[PDB]
Amino acid sequence: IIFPEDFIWGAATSSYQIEGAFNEDGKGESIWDRFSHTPGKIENGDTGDIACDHYHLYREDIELMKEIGIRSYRFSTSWPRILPEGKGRVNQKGLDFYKRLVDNLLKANIRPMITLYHWDLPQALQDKGGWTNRDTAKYFAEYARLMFEEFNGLVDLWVTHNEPWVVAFEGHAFGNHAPGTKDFKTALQVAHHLLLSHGMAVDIFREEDLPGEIGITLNLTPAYPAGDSEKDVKAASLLDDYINAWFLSPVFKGSYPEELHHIYEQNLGAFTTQPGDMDIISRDIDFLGINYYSRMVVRHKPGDNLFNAEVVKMEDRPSTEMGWEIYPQGLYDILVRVNKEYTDKPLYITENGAAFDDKLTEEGKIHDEKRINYLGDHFKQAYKALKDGVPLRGYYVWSLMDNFEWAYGYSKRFGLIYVDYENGNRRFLKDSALWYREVIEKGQV
Numbered sequence: 001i002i003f004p005e006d007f008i009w010g011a012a013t014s015s016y017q018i019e020g021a022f023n024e025d026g027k028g029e030s031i032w033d034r035f036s037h038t039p040g041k042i043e044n045g046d047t048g049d050i051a052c053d054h055y056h057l058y059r060e061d062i063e064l065m066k067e068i069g070i071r072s073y074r075f076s077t078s079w080p081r082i083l084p085e086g087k088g089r090v091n092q093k094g095l096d097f098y099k100r101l102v103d104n105l106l107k108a109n110i111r112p113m114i115t116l117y118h119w120d121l122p123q124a125l126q127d128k129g130g131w132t133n134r135d136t137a138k139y140f141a142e143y144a145r146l147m148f149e150e151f152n153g154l155v156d157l158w159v160t161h162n163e164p165w166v167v168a169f170e171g172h173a174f175g176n177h178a179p180g181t182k183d184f185k186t187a188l189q190v191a192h193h194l195l196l197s198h199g200m201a202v203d204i205f206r207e208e209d210l211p212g213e214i215g216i217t218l219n220l221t222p223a224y225p226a227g228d229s230e231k232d233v234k235a236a237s238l239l240d241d242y243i244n245a246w247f248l249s250p251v252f253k254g255s256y257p258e259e260l261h262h263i264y265e266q267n268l269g270a271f272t273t274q275p276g277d278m279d280i281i282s283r284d285i286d287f288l289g290i291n292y293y294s295r296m297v298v299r300h301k302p303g304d305n306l307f308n309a310e311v312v313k314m315e316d317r318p319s320t321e322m323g324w325e326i327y328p329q330g331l332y333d334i335l336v337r338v339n340k341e342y343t344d345k346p347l348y349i350t351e352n353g354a355a356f357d358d359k360l361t362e363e364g365k366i367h368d369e370k371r372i373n374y375l376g377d378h379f380k381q382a383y384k385a386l387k388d389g390v391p392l393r394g395y396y397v398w399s400l401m402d403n404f405e406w407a408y409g410y411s412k413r414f415g416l417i418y419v420d421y422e423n424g425n426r427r428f429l430k431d432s433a434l435w436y437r438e439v440i441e442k443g444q445v
């Protein structure tokens with residue numbers, strides 16, 4: 001298991017999950033500040049108010065990055081830290097933070113990858129409808145241009161959106177994420193606008209002519225039939241379209257998946273689009289980021305939902321603390337499938353990782369063997385994709401450090417680095433960090 005010497009090994013984080021400084025230096029309120037300050041939304045009543053305090057501690061975190069020896073760092077930039085009202089006047093101190101961060105990364109010889117939108121929409125824009133208001137797509141594109149202007153020649157890897165499926169459905173259909181709406185029609189409308197805003201930002205990226213590459217990051221969950229049944233095969237196919245094709249087909253083919261689009265329209269009425277929208281969404285991009293964690297097993301079950309499809313819990317197979325099945329073969333399957341059916345573009349694993357119950361010892365050690373085993377098994381499947389012709393260029397571990405795990409708060413730890421929040425927010429390299437360091441050095445597992 002040997003990787004190319006120029007293979008981009010990285011680690012990823014997101015702004016709201018690590019930064020803290022939620023109302024400091026002119027930053028505006030985000031929907032996640034609002035959501036986390038609403039009673040009952042987050043486990044244990046945790047908030048992202050302080051989190052890892054990366055906003056103040058970023059210079060120390062870069063030192064740890066160098067220690068591990070990662071070649072690239074994927075992070076997201078907070079829209080309301082930069083534009084408190086989502087539009088209008090720039091908050092120079094918010095922007096100065098990211099300028100300092102980037103200059104530091106480059107001096108450390110770590111390649112930055114910026115995600116423009118990783119879920120922290122300005123609350124000011126939410127009060128005007130958020131992602132159901134087509135104007136939000138335009139403001140996003142103006143924000144994108146601002147960032148392209150400021151980081152021209154400094155950042156050469158760009159992702160417009162992280163996981164539009166999760167933003168749309170978890171945030172607007174099931175209400176588990178900010179803003180917390182529970183309206184499936186709204187979800188579909190939001191998904192369309194996220195896609196539109198993506199294409200709008202790609203157009204601007206070309207126009208600004210800065211060097212580097214732009215893509216989008218999609219969470220992908222391959223679906224597998226629970227039985228030999230042709231009926232299960234079709235049900236599994238449908239849930240697969242629900243998560244994967246719903247976003248992959250517009251971006252790369254310029255259309256939504258037909259059968260699913262029909263099912264939605266007949267049960268819910270049509271969501272609002274304009275002519276030429278599919279052209280914008282499907283602009284040519286430079287790479288696809290894939291976020292992979294697990295798979296779903298599907299049986300046919302008429303009634304009980306719109307797709308007539310039920311997800312089977314695999315209780316007999318290993319799982320992480322999130323309750324997600326461990327299934328490394330899925331990572332291979334999705335890379336191959338993407339390269340076969342959707343695109344010949346370079347692919348990056350922009351997130352993959354696992355939560356396990358981590359224990360900090362007295363000498364400041366964390367023996368997270370299960371995380372090492374999870375990561376090793378997934379690296380091996382990425383190698384196998386690479387060997388078989390997939391143009392995989394890089395792999396980012398989620399996450400560089402323990403952080404605010406959305407609705408679960410701080411109770412779920414995904415980091416290579418343990419964060420001892422209440423003791424000066426001190427950082428400790430887990431054994432998985434030490435293992436990853438050896439992997440990157442030698443390019444082999």
